[PDB]
Amino acid sequence: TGYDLSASTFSPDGRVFQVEYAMKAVENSSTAIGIRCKDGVVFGVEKLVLSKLYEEGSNKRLFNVDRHVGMAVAGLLADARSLADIAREEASNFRSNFGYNIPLKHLADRVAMYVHAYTLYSAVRPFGCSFMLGSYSVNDGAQLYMIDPSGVSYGYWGCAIGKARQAAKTEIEKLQMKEMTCRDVVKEVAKIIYIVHDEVKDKAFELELSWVGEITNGRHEIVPKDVREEAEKYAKESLK
Amino acid sequence: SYDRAITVFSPDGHLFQVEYAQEAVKKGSTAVGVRGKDIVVLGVEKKSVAKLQDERTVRKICALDDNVCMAFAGLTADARIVINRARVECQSHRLTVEDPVTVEYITRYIASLKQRYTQSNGRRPFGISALIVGFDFDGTPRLYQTDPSGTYHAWKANAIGRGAKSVREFLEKNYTDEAIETDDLTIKLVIKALLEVVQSGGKNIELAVMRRDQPLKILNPEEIEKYVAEIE
Amino acid sequence: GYSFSLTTFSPSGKLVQIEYALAAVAGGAPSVGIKAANGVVLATEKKQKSILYDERSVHKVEPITKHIGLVYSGMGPDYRVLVHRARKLAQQYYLVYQEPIPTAQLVQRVASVMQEYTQSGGVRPFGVSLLICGWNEGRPYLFQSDPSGAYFAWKATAMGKNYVNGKTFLEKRYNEDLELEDAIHTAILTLKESFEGQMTEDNIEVGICNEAGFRRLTPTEVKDYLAAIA
Amino acid sequence: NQYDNDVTVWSPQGRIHQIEYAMEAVKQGSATVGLKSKTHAVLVALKRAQSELAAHQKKILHVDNHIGISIAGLTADARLLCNFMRQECLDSRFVFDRPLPVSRLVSLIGSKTQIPTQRYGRRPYGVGLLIAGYDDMGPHIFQTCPSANYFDCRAMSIGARSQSARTYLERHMSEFMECNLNELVKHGLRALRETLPAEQDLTTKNVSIGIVGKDLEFTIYDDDDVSPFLEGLEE
Amino acid sequence: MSRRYDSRTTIFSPEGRLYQVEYAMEAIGHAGTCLGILANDGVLLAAERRNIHKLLDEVFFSEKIYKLNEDMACSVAGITSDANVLTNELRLIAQRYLLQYQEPIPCEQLVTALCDIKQAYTQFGGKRPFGVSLLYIGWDKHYGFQLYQSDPSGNYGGWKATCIGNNSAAAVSMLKQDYKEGEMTLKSALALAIKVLNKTMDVSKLSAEKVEIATLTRENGKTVIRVLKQKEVEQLIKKHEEEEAK
Amino acid sequence: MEYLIGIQGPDYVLVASDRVAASNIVQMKDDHDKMFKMSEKILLLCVGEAGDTVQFAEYIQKNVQLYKMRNGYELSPTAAANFTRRNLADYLRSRTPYHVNLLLAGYDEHEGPALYYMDYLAALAKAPFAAHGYGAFLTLSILDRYYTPTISREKAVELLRKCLEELQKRFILNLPTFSVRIIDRNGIHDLDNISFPK
Amino acid sequence: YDRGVNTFSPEGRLFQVEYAIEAIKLGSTAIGIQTSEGVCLAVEKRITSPLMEPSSIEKIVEIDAHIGCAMSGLIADAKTLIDKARVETQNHWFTYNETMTVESVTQAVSNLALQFGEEDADPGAMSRPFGVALLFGGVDEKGPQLFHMDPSGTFVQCDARAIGSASEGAQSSLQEVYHKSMTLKEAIKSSLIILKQVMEEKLNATNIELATVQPGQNFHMFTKEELEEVIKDI
Amino acid sequence: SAGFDRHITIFSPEGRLYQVEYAFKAINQGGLTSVAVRGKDCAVIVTQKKVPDKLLDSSTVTHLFKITENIGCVMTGMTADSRSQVQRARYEAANWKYKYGYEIPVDMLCKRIADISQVYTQNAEMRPLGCCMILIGIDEEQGPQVYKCDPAGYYCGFKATAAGVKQTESTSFLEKKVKKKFDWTFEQTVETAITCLSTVLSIDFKPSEIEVGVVTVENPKFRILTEAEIDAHLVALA
């Protein structure tokens, strides 16, 4: 009887529907995945091109958070573009205040604190986005976290966001991602994305990948097309 | 603080909140006025008197300045705020500009005062319609009626309150320029216009006038008794 | 932040929200207090579902200062904030006037804060009631406050469930010239008439004030009061 | 009814109907088109008039020397953002002494549209925008939306009958990069030709264009400057 | 702020009236019966205490008969809650007059100063109005003895006589027939008040613990507010017990 | 420095002041009016820095007029003083403290005439007579000689000129042009401005 | 009730802006016309009662020497915008020591028109948009230009437009009557012919107002003096 | 029910709060459980860890928290509410030591935390947090202490606690168990506390299935028990 009219009200079952409805916007968002490895972390994005008018590089869901940190999101595409600056705030302030690079956990903390800040009131709405954050460090190495629309942070060997999660997750639970190198698995990561894909609504798409890890010496970089074509044209061999 | 939209439109475009402010004006006390040459006569009839009331506090005829007085008909609540703020505007107009308060200028501030709280967020419109009377430089009579909506006009003869539509309609036939040459022609005619709602009464009626450069004066029941003595 | 007051008038004119608060403090744990002779006696009962919860840890009886202490019947957690602001007003009193605060003036300044939350927006009224115990200028003081902020005063009173029976039991047993020790007896008698079942020293929570200050009783001296002697 | 009321209300579908009806404001107004070459970028928008006595509303605005915009949607939301866009273009040279990249400028355009979406009681701007400009990397056309998302395209047909005229942009898209100043206009005029029947043509009063280019900073041509371009080509 | 959870207290009715304000007009009608009488040599206020019980402390004072300042006192009829908040804010504004002008505040200036606070709510701020009705008596350096009556809406006015609380309407009917305008005096207002009370009082036996009356009399060039002890009051009650029949 | 003087009589208060305002080595205008009309029965004077006199006076002057409108009756002289002082003392701690030396005159409905003395330090002292400026050095010794609380207003006018003409015989400034106004039961009345037929 | 001022309609319209047009249709009817010599602005006073003085209601005010102002629809909302534009003109003149063009004057009105809102606003915010209609004529180096404005703040150069209750029958006829470069005084008398048709009352001298502007002459309001010669041709 | 009492926070016709009681029962929706037992020299918390995904890291996901040097923590409820509320608990002890210059006791720590959760209940503005906080530690004079803070703000010293999906059944199960009233040493407090959740949930916990934090007199710094010693306590039943 209107229990869910705002997020500030708890349902008689104790379940908050508005934050759950905000997750349903993520549940209907496009699927992107990334997985950490021993050498580093790899990111990926499935971009949906509806019309030929879209230029290459448009609708880029690959984000640059910091020197050693990238970002990949699932949800409303303008949401994390605010969090992009917010993530750069902690990236700039930490290096300004404490004078060295920020670990992934400390960044995933205050951001998750900022995600949960908007679930409280009735005068704001929670984030309609869910994202993962990897990195690489010398004392730490590849770590993988994810922040849901409710602001919860978990450690992950692997993770999936967007429309179909367990479709990739179960397959990621079947194949061991632990001791393998991101350079070898980046070919199979595209294959998992192609398995998540189905043609009913969506027709054509493209793959977007990013670099962080020992191959990049810890500094987050971007993959060139040809090296990705080595995975792409190999994923075309595994497409069937 | 408190920010919310108060005044909104209607399916036909009318203002619900503003029209209800005009409803309390008609169902309040009845006040009238007429603009002569040398003098303007005002009056109000209060039938709520139980004989136990002190008649100093019930006065709805106030003075915003020596050159400008006022009366009102409507909800008595919001009237006291406008009476105070306008008197503050008077002295502030004198403090800023040595010239006295212009009768037309003080209305535009009050009209903007009303309209502001009407359209501004987290406010309420005034339930008062005030009659502002004042004379400009060198014997220039000016009579003003206001509206809770903020629109003001000028009137040679005017009426507000209960059954004032018929009073204006009664004056429509009975108001000419052969009359209102002297205050005696204005007053009696006003009382003749007051005879619409007369209950066998008029000690309930309080009269006050302002004439030229002269300061405000309130008529006593004795001067009223002379006018009450002539009915037929 | 809400700037709009959460309480409005009823078609009958009575406050609807605060009227519910009287039923909120009604179903709470009963409490008894009496102003007798040298001080004011307050006997409450701390009851839980099992002995698993410690008595000494958290007490319903808390001192506001050496002189003054409070009890309550109603929502439990709502009594917390009232303790801080009291002591905060008590210290801000003691900073200005360098003296202990009289029981009279203290309640008005505390009740004014309670009534600010029935006016300003986005704040609900309190679901707990206060019994003010203080001793000043030689004469003991016992006051009663409600959720609406109205402060009362009583020679003897009762609060919580079964106050109907309690008030009738007070008009019977209560008399004048009763000592603090005798006022403890009447408070225990009312609780025996109110509470159902066996009554131990761990259930009942008692504290008093006198010329020597406000002190909370020990479980050992209550054993003699569990025998229905004084 | 229930959940359709406010922007911050999450429907069980997850969609925000006030952002939905914000995108509807684009369909409720005149069609605007823009396009770019390897260097030049051209904005051709249909100027709309309510009646035939009144002149046609000018949708083309001036942002900076190298940047200009056009709107399809609510008409007064432009000057709200236009004051900020013209301010940021001044902030660039006031500090960096160089023209601001379009990707950095549009990222700030989305900002102002991100705040009211997640806060109660406010409204997004439901007007469609066309942002084109020349910089170190050449022409970049970034279209925004009331959803606060910004895109990048070579050409766009938006507004009333948007998808109907995109077939012309889809067929000649390969030419748009190879098109010269005239060939951008030749396909720029026929871009609006697909938005109107032959009974409504491109004329001096109801049509205005603008062009920014490699060595040519953004300029606006309205009636007689486009007269040799308007006349001589047929619908 | 949302919408639904905001009840919009400041919106007019379709009849051009205020619901919350008029609910307070009935709310004060269920309050304690209270009246006052303006006389030549003084003024008094009769107030019934809604709590009549044996265990009541009753050691302090008349409880709803307060003291505003040196000049003035006040009675209380309404919700006892908001009455205490006003008395503090009244003393504040009352001392600010004495701060700058170094004079005791007159009765009219003090009333018109508070009523702007009441109207600052009904007009704007979103807060609920007051459910309290107050009578104002006092002496000033100009107008002398004054009797004022406030309301929840902020309006007020002077009165020769008036009654508030329960049975205020019918209490005026006895004041219409019996009361002589301006003729009454302090000692004669005693008999006049209780003679109207005893019939309008719903609870019989006419005891001092029910209605406790205070007076305001200026003495030696200074205003003095006095509360008659139950001894003298019961003597005045027995005086009415004489004047009821004998 | 400009000079002010006033005298409180039993039924009256008589004030006199110089109308000359000067700067540098020259006297710009000799008709400058120091005497300001606050209300019907109340009138005010001031002296100080050239710009602060007229600036600060209108604030205290017009604020009394706002009171007269609300209650219908004007302030008493006693209420005007303490309202002027506290408002003057507040401007001291601000960035622009006003240099002020003033004389407050008025006719109360009971106390009758009243005279009040204040300085740029905002110190209110009720006295039957007061002076300001450098003239207070060469004048006030004359008043204590010839003044009595029972003095008539016509004796005051006489003794006033005896105090005023001392400035040209000794004091270095000219200050030929003086003004005179008086308040009584009937309120503010005016007298001929004192001049010096050189 | 149960809605905000920023809530879009199912058709993609602002609620208060939808009814802002319906609020204008209850007001007075005005017709502006652009021509070579200037911009004609004429409106009937729409007297609501005989006892009202016709000088009380003034629907034509002069902000700039060559540029005037008009009022239609809701009467109160104009006096709020009267000062706003007059501040902008002098704030512009105090800066550059020159007169603002007629095109930029309409730019400053739409800036304050959309300031309405609820959350994230100032204390001087507006709850609802302005329900007043504005026709701004004037002459400058750019020439005489007629500007029609709506409640939403949209302004455009216009040959002729009809606003107010009688606009319907007038606007359809304005397309017929107004042609090309036809002069100013001919557009004055040709308007009153249709105005006499669209109004529900008889045409009187003081019942309407007439004011125009020329390139080498300041904007001037015409009293009953010239109005006798106006009505002389009918 | 009358009016909006089913939505915002206002007193019911009988004088209760529906919204607060809703979120109170929302703690059961966490799909887990926790318990805390006070020993002679130590305070033991046995809480459940749910790791359904092998991708989910077991170490980084924990209810056991470190508030300060000498104090640990555990949380039962919504993780978003928990993880956020613990950050403010660290501000206190920080500001505490910045103010009074010593470690905050377990007593005063729960007070300031739970009193701020009351600002939720008092306001329809901010919703209460569905996280049920249980704090332990050491007070060198009183030894170990065990507290639990409900979303309403109520707290008391507990010999044993109840949290998670089954709460009322926990205290009912702890009736006969605590009725023994024997003195539990460090190892006896650990071994007895493990029996609690093992019998009710019908599991027979594995070392990886749960996690147990402890703090002791001799070791005032908080101690995280590794899985090596957990199985050593698990064989006490066998």
Are D151 and A58 in contact (CB < 8 Å)? yes
Cβ distance D101 to D135 under 8 Å? yes
Which residues in chain C have Cβ-Cβ distances shorter than 8 Å to B122? 3
Q: Compute, in degrees rounded to 10, the torsion defined by CA atoms C141, C146, C149, C154.
A: -30
Which residues in chain E have Cβ-Cβ distances shorter than 8 Å to B58? 157-158
Tokens of A35: 């997985």
Closest CA–CA distance from residue C115 to any residue of chain E (Å): 7
Distance in angstroms (rounded) separating the CA atoms of residues F48 and F3: 10
Side-chain half-sphere exposure of C40, counting CA atoms within 13 A:
30
Q: Which amino acid is at H143?
A: G
DSSP per residue, D202-234:
--TTTEEEEEE-SSS--EEE-SSSSHHHHTT--
Residue C75 backbone dihedrals phi, psi, to 5 degrees: -60, 125
Cβ distance A43 to A62 under 8 Å? yes
Delimit the domains of chain H by residue range: 1-238
Distance in angstroms (rounded) separating the CA atoms of residues A147 and F114: 79
Distance in angstroms (rounded) separating the CA atoms of residues A189 and A33: 8
Are E99 and F78 in contact (CB < 8 Å)? no
Nearest to F83 among E101, E106, E112 (CB): E101
Resolution (A): 4.1
Tokens of E69: 């300042």
Cβ distance B224 to B198 under 8 Å? no
User: What's the DSSP call for residue D115?
Assistant: T
Cα angle value A72/A75/A78 (rounded, 5°)? 85
- Residue holding tokens 């170094």? E102
Q: Who contacts G189 (Cβ-Cβ below 8 Å, separation ≥6)?
A: G230, G233, G234
Pairing mode, strands B39-45 and B205-211 = antiparallel
Distance in angstroms (rounded) separating the CA atoms of residues C59 and C69: 12
Which residues in chain B have Cβ-Cβ distances shorter than 8 Å to E14? 20
- Render the burial of E35-67: b for 16+ CB within 10 Å, e for the rest: bbbbbeebbbbbbbbbeeeebbbbeeebbbbbb
Using alpha carbons, list the distances in angstroms from residue G55 to B153, B157, B160, G198: 9, 15, 21, 23
Q: Could you give the 3-state DSSP secondary structure of residue C104?
A: helix
Determination technique for this entry: cryo-EM
Side-chain half-sphere exposure of E57, counting CA atoms within 13 A:
21
Q: Which CATH class is domain C1-229?
A: alpha beta
**Max Cα–Cα distance, chain D, nearest Å:** 56
Domains and CATH numbers, chain G: 2-234 (3.60.20.10)
Cβ distance D194 to D167 under 8 Å? yes
DSSP per residue, F39-78:
SSSEEEEEEESHHHHHHHHHHHHHHHHHHHHHHSSPPPHH
DSSP per residue, C12-41:
TSSBHHHHHHHHHHHSS--EEEEEETTEEE
Q: Could you give the 3-state DSSP secondary structure of residue A74?
A: strand
Cβ distance H214 to H236 under 8 Å? no
Mutual angle of helices D181-193 and D162-171, in 10-degree steps: 150
Q: C33 to chain E: nearest residue by CA? A: E55
User: What's the DSSP call for residue C224?
Assistant: G
Using alpha carbons, list the distances in angstroms from residue B97 to B2, B106, B111, F67: 35, 13, 21, 19
Which residues in chain G have Cβ-Cβ distances shorter than 8 Å to E4? 2
Distance in angstroms (rounded) separating the CA atoms of residues F108 and A197: 96
Cβ distance B206 to B218 under 8 Å? yes
Closest CA to H68 of H114, H119, H108: H108
Q: What sign for the dihedral angle of Cα E55, E57, E58, E63? A: negative
Q: What sign for the dihedral angle of Cα D28, D33, D34, D37? A: positive
Q: How many CB pairs under 8 A join C and E?
A: 102
Q: Which amino acid is at A59?
A: N
Distance in angstroms (rounded) separating the CA atoms of residues G132 and B151: 13
Are A15 and H29 in contact (CB < 8 Å)? yes
Cα-only R_g, chain H: 18
Sheet holding B157-160, edge to edge: B157-160, B30-35, B39-45, B205-211, B217-218
Are A152 and H83 in contact (CB < 8 Å)? yes
Cβ distance G116 to G129 under 8 Å? yes
Using alpha carbons, list the distances in angstroms from residue G184 to C67, G44, G45, G232: 92, 18, 21, 17
Which residues in chain B have Cβ-Cβ distances shorter than 8 Å to C3? 1-3, 122
- Residue holding tokens 């300004």? A96
Delimit the domains of chain C by residue range: 1-229
Q: Which CATH class is domain H1-238?
A: alpha beta
Distance in angstroms (rounded) separating the CA atoms of residues A24 and A10: 18
- Partner chains of A (3+ C-beta pairs under 8 Å): D, E, H
Cβ distance H63 to H74 under 8 Å? yes
Delimit the domains of chain A by residue range: 1-240
Note the residue count of chain C: 230
Are B87 and F69 in contact (CB < 8 Å)? yes
Distance in angstroms (rounded) separating the CA atoms of residues E237 and E231: 10
Which residues in chain A have Cβ-Cβ distances shorter than 8 Å to H81? 116
Q: What is the SS3 assignment for chain G?
A: CCCCCCCECCCCCEHHHHHHHHHHCCCCCEEEEECCCCEEEEEECCCCCCCECCCCCCCEEECCCCEEEECEECCHHHHHHHHHHHHHHHHHHHHHCCCCCHHHHHHHHHHHHCCCCCCCCCCCCECCCCCEEEEECECCCCCCCCEEECCCCCEEEECEEEECCCHHHHHHHHHHHCCCCCCHHHHHHHHHHHHHHHCCCCCCCCCEEEEEEECCEEEEEECHHHHHHHHHCC
Closest CA to F117 of F151, F77, F145: F77
Domains and CATH numbers, chain B: 9-232 (3.60.20.10)
Distance in angstroms (rounded) separating the CA atoms of residues G165 and G198: 9
Q: Does E124 touch chain G (CB under 8 A)?
A: no
Q: Which amino acid is at D157?
A: S
Tokens of A138: 């010398």
User: What's the DSSP call for residue D54?
Assistant: B
* Most C CBs within 10 Å, among E2, E4, E23, to test the C interface: E23
Strand blocks (E) in chain C: 31-36, 39-45, 62-63, 69-74, 128-136, 139-145, 151-153, 156-159, 204-209, 215-216
Nearest to B78 among E16, E108, E123 (CB): E123
Which residues in chain E have Cβ-Cβ distances shorter than 8 Å to G123? none
Tokens of D52: 């035939």
Q: How many CB pairs under 8 A join B and G?
A: 93
Q: D120 to chain E: nearest residue by CA? A: E2
Q: Which amino acid is at F2?
A: E
Q: Which amino acid is at H73?
A: C
Closest CA–CA distance from residue A125 to any residue of chain D (Å): 5
Distance in angstroms (rounded) separating the CA atoms of residues B74 and B65: 22
Distance in angstroms (rounded) separating the CA atoms of residues E217 and A25: 75
Pairing mode, strands E43-48 and E66-67 = unpaired
Tokens of E126: 């979103």
Closest CA to B43 of B220, B223, B205, B230: B205
Q: Compute, in degrees rounded to 10, the torsion defined by CA atoms F84, F89, F92, F96.
A: -20
CB count in 10 Å sphere of residue E172: 18
Distance in angstroms (rounded) separating the CA atoms of residues C168 and C155: 14
Which residues in chain C have Cβ-Cβ distances shorter than 8 Å to B123? none
Q: Could you give the 3-state DSSP secondary structure of residue C76?
A: coil
Cβ distance F180 to F192 under 8 Å? yes
Cα angle value A181/A185/A190 (rounded, 5°)? 155
Question: In chain H, after which residues does the backbone break, taking C–N over 2.5 angstroms as a break?
Answer: none
- Partner chains of G (3+ C-beta pairs under 8 Å): B, D, E
DSSP lists the bridge partners of residue B130 as B72
Which residues in chain E have Cβ-Cβ distances shorter than 8 Å to B2? 1, 124-126
Distance in angstroms (rounded) separating the CA atoms of residues C174 and C171: 6
Q: Does B4 touch chain G (CB under 8 A)?
A: yes
Distance in angstroms (rounded) separating the CA atoms of residues A177 and A183: 12
Q: Which amino acid is at C200?
A: T
Distance in angstroms (rounded) separating the CA atoms of residues B72 and B75: 9
Tokens of H194: 């493990």
Q: H6 to chain E: nearest residue by CA? A: E5
Q: B124 to chain E: nearest residue by CA? A: E123
Q: Does E3 touch chain A (CB under 8 A)?
A: no
Which residues in chain E have Cβ-Cβ distances shorter than 8 Å to B22? 16
Tokens of B207: 């009269």
Q: Who contacts F152 (Cβ-Cβ below 8 Å, separation ≥6)?
A: F9
**Max Cα–Cα distance, chain F, nearest Å:** 50
Q: How many CB pairs under 8 A join A and E?
A: 5
Q: Does domain E2-246 have CATH number 3.40.50.300?
A: no
Distance in angstroms (rounded) separating the CA atoms of residues A55 and D137: 14
Side-chain half-sphere exposure of H139, counting CA atoms within 13 A:
15
Are G158 and D18 in contact (CB < 8 Å)? no
Distance of CA A153 to the CA centre of its chain: 13
Q: B92 to chain F: nearest residue by CA? A: F62
CB count in 10 Å sphere of residue G137: 26
Q: G24 to chain B: nearest residue by CA? A: B13
Are G79 and B119 in contact (CB < 8 Å)? no
Mutual angle of helices D102-114 and D77-95, in 10-degree steps: 130
Closest CA to F167 of F158, F155, F177: F177
Q: Who contacts C139 (Cβ-Cβ below 8 Å, separation ≥6)?
A: none
Q: D6 to chain E: nearest residue by CA? A: E2
Distance in angstroms (rounded) separating the CA atoms of residues E145 and E40: 8
Distance of CA H91 to the CA centre of its chain: 19
Q: Who contacts E167 (Cβ-Cβ below 8 Å, separation ≥6)?
A: E33, E200, E202
Which residues in chain E have Cβ-Cβ distances shorter than 8 Å to H8? 5
Cβ distance E182 to E40 under 8 Å? yes
Closest CA–CA distance from residue D166 to any residue of chain A (Å): 9
